[PDB]
Amino acid sequence: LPPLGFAIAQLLGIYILAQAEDSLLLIDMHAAAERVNYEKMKRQRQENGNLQSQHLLIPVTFAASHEECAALADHAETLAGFGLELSDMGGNTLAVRAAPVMLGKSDVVSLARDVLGELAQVGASHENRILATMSCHGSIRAGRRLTLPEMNALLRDMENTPRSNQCNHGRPTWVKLTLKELDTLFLR
Amino acid sequence: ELPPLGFAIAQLLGIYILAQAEDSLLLIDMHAAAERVNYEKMKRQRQENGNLQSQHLLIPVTFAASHEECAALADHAETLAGFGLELSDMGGNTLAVRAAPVMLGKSDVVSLARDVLGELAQVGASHENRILATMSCHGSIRAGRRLTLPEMNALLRDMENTPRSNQCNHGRPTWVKLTLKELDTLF
């Protein structure tokens, strides 16, 4: 059955343990979820030009810096490019109107901030950097408590992800220990 | 807080219990840990009490036996009670198990009776360890039996409560610990 096997448990919040044919896999879940996210976004930005938003049911308002308000004013277009709709409603309060479908909300503010934060820097092809930053913000990350099928869904996505096994920063996203090597841990 | 072997989170490849202790993963060699635990419980009961405390089955378990097993029963009924086992002949080479050691999880009491009877065929008290060794393979944790997370924890608590739980016969560790830092090092 599948190369990344089946989820068996989650560890000190950081790891997914899975059982593959004759092996244990330890998947760095955050680093893995990021990679999937990044690629799925890099693809969409390539195939539909923009990322698709979702018109928030309850517009989440938040206290912004001037710097952030300025970024919104200068890059309204670009933010729609990344499936983010925001409006500036005085006294440094911003409102999130719409967030990307493919990040299933969660601290929408924290996402908004980060992108504003990235756009602030531009003073184009800042794309990869921005998506990498956006890649950290999906359903799985920082918080934990996944179900086994949630974990399975991830390993499935990973199997369809054209640089699984690599975080935004070079490291592997999983380790495999074969039956042979496991046995070797118990060496006399 | 947490006990040293932590809590079971899964079973792996039929062979290992995975546990989470503080800041670490443990892998336990389930069979080796169980054998070791069982041996020590028993050998200690034998030196403390002279004999293993047996427990009666509500419905005796019958099985077809070889002539050699029957002759073994006839010769060593007393020795067998010393090992917490009681059987009845019954005739036509059928034996019944009436009682099996407390320290075991049944386990096919038939399998156990057969192994111990077999071990008794080859003697005519210096066999102690040999016998307890064989018996130790027959608790509730053994071969392709899938455990619940509470059963897995009960073995871990047992280990913590057993001397020499850390090594098997060969002097092989029974468990291995990987800390958060070590885990990250493998990346």
Numbering used by the authors:
A (entry chain B): 464 to 586, 592 to 656
B (entry chain A): 463 to 586, 592 to 654
Which statements did the authors publish about this structure?
NgoL is the MutL homolog in Neisseria gonorrhoeae- a bacterium that is representative of organisms lacking homologs of MutH. In case of NgoL also, endonucleolytic activity is present in the C-terminal domain that is abrogated by mutations of the invariant residues in the metal binding motif. The fact that NgoL harbors a nicking endonuclease activity in its CTD presents a conundrum as to how a homodimeric molecule with two active sites does not create double-strand breaks.
To answer these questions, we have determined the crystal structure of the C-terminal domain of NgoL (NgoL-CTD). Six leucine residues (L474, L475, L480, L487, L489 and L650) from each monomer are oriented into the interface leading to the formation of highly hydrophobic surfaces that come together to form a very stable dimer. The metal binding motif in NgoL-CTD has the sequence DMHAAAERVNYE, which aligns well with the established consensus sequence of DQHA(X)2E(X)4E, and extends from residues 491 to 502. Therefore, the active site in case of NgoL-CTD can be considered to be a composite of these four conserved motifs. As reflected in their B-factors, sections of monomer B appear to be more mobile than corresponding regions in monomer A. Overall, the two monomers in the crystal structure of NgoL-CTD show dissimilarities in structure and a significant difference in mobility of certain stretches and therefore the two monomers are related by a pseudo and not a real twofold axis.
